[PDB]
Ligand binder design. Structure first.
Ligand code: ZN
Ligand code: ZN
Lengths: 69, 57, 44
């Protein structure tokens, strides 16, 4: 849904890295491994949190009951 | 009034069925075609399945 | 305005002995709105 603020296994804060990860994938032609490395995620426990996030809140947000559609 | 479109979201929210209207035209024939009294008639609400040609989606 | 229409999302307030319907359109489903009240939690 929304990016987990802290990695489950260790506790390194990965919640502030989702947008920068998307930028590194979009602007630069960096693959996921290189982008995760550059973001500072060393342990694979930290790498999986940002590598496998789905970000379903974007799909959840289109059903807004407080706005005229 | 003018009939509007009812959507399955409305049907789920109302906790009621999502059914169309079934119309049959009866042929009240008498004496092998001396005179025929045609008449269409509503036959209650026929439930329809989603994403079918009888659904707004 | 304690209610929100479920089709046009327009705020509307219902008095007693009043029609349960929207005013800008003719939708019969009204969503209740969330006001400002304290809801204590635990950051667990
Ligand atoms: Zn970790
Ligand atoms: Zn309305």
């Amino acid at each position: 849904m929304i990016v987990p603020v802290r990695c489950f296994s260790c506790g390194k804060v990965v919640g502030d890295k989702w947008e920068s990860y998307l930028n590194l994938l979009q602007e630069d032609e960096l693959d996921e491994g290189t982008a995760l490395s550059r973001l500072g995620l060393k342990r694979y426990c930290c790498r999986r949190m940002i590598l496998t996030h789905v970000d379903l809140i974007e799909k959840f947000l289109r059903y807004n009951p407080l706005e005229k559609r | 009034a003018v009939e509007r479109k009812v959507y399955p979201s409305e049907s789920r929210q109302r906790l009621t069925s999502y059914r169309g209207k079934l119309l049959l035209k009866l042929k009240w024939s008498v004496n092998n075609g001396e005179e025929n009294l045609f008449e269409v008639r509503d036959c209650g609400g026929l439930p329809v399945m989603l994403q079918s040609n009888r659904c707004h989606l | 305005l304690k209610y929100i229409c479920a089709e046009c999302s327009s705020k509307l307030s219902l008095s007693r002995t009043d029609a349960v319907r929207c005013k800008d359109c003719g939708h019969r489903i009204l969503l209740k709105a969330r006001t400002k009240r304290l809801v204590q939690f635990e950051a667990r």
